[PDB]
Amino acid sequence: GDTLTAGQKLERGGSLQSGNGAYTLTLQDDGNLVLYARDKAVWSTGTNGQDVVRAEVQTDGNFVLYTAEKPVWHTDTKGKKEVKLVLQDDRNLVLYAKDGPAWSLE
Amino acid sequence: GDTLTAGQKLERGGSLQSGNGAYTLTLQDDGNLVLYARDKAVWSTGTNGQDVVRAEVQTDGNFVLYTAEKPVWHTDTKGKKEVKLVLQDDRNLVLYAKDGPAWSLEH
Ligand SMILES: OC[C@H]1O[C@@H](O)[C@@H](O)[C@@H](O)[C@@H]1O
Ligand SMILES: OC[C@H]1O[C@H](O)[C@@H](O)[C@@H](O)[C@@H]1O
Ligand SMILES: OC[C@H]1O[C@H](O)[C@@H](O)[C@@H](O)[C@@H]1O
Ligand SMILES: OC[C@H]1O[C@H](O)[C@@H](O)[C@@H](O)[C@@H]1O
Numbered sequence: 001g002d003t004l005t006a007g008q009k010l011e012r013g014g015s016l017q018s019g020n021g022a023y024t025l026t027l028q029d030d031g032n033l034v035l036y037a038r039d040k041a042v043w044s045t046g047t048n049g050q051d052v053v054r055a056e057v058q059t060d061g062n063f064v065l066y067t068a069e070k071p072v073w074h075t076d077t078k079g080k081k082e083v084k085l086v087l088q089d090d091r092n093l094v095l096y097a098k099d100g101p102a103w104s105l106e
Numbered sequence: 107g108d109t110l111t112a113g114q115k116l117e118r119g120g121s122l123q124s125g126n127g128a129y130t131l132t133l134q135d136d137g138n139l140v141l142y143a144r145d146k147a148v149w150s151t152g153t154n155g156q157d158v159v160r161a162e163v164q165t166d167g168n169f170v171l172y173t174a175e176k177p178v179w180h181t182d183t184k185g186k187k188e189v190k191l192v193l194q195d196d197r198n199l200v201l202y203a204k205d206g207p208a209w210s211l212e213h
């Protein structure tokens with residue numbers, strides 16, 4: 001609506017509106033939380049070019065924009081079944097899967 | 107323990123250790139997943155400074171280091187109670203707290 005209570009958030013595409021639809025606060029896919037007043041953008045968080053996933057009115061009192069949790073490193077073994085990571089006594093760190101070792105440190 | 111099975115994770119400060127007690131794989135506070143043999147680092151993911159907060163062995167078969175959700179903008183009003191954000195008909199964007207306006211746009 002026009003209000004975000006504690007624990008509520010705007011996700012990408014979500015919005016608040018007021019002034020008979022003339023005013024729109026919206027979290028964009030470029031990452032920016034923007035307030036559009038009619039034709040013009042009157043204010044933003046300046047978070048364009050950043051991977052902002054939500055604008056949460058937190059229960060601790062703080063309204064906060066967060067970038068998404070992202071992967072930064074992987075074994076690159078998506079698709080493998082029943083996997084387990086084992087730190088072995090031969091010092092090798094091995095990712096095992098249904099049809100044998102999918103990834104190996106050594 | 108020496109094993110993480112499908113869906114498990116090391117969290118910050120969490121460790122795997124080999125059965126013999128000689129090798130220790132630790133997701134550290136600095137984000138680096140480090141393998142120690144004794145007190146000498148023999149391998150790491152080199153993710154120090156990259157905000158990694160967990161390393162989960164996923165059900166899809168992929169072992170992945172994930173970052174935390176990073177705060178990139180805020181109103182700086184931690185401590186305020188019963189807060190709500192209101193986009194008003196006068197065009198103002200106001201964060202209202204128990205004791206009054208904690209933050210506003212038009213000021
Ligand atoms: O980079 C790791 C990413 O790659 C994918 O193929 C999936 O397994 C995701 O869950 C993961 O976040
Ligand atoms: O000032 C707000 C303005 O910032 C950038 O230029 C872009 O993200 C626009 O989408 C947005 O309207
Ligand atoms: O490639 C994985 C393979 O590497 C080595 O040969 C050993 O550490 C084995 O335990 C492991 O299965
Ligand atoms: O830097 C933003 C940060 O401010 C505080 O420490 C808390 O309200 C956190 O939840 C929030 O992420």
Ligand SMILES: OC[C@H]1O[C@H](O)[C@@H](O)[C@@H](O)[C@@H]1O
Pocket residue numbers: 194196198200207209210212213
């Ligand atoms: O500073 C916040 C305060 O600013 C203006 O005076 C008005 O828009 C009020 O509705 C709002 O509460």
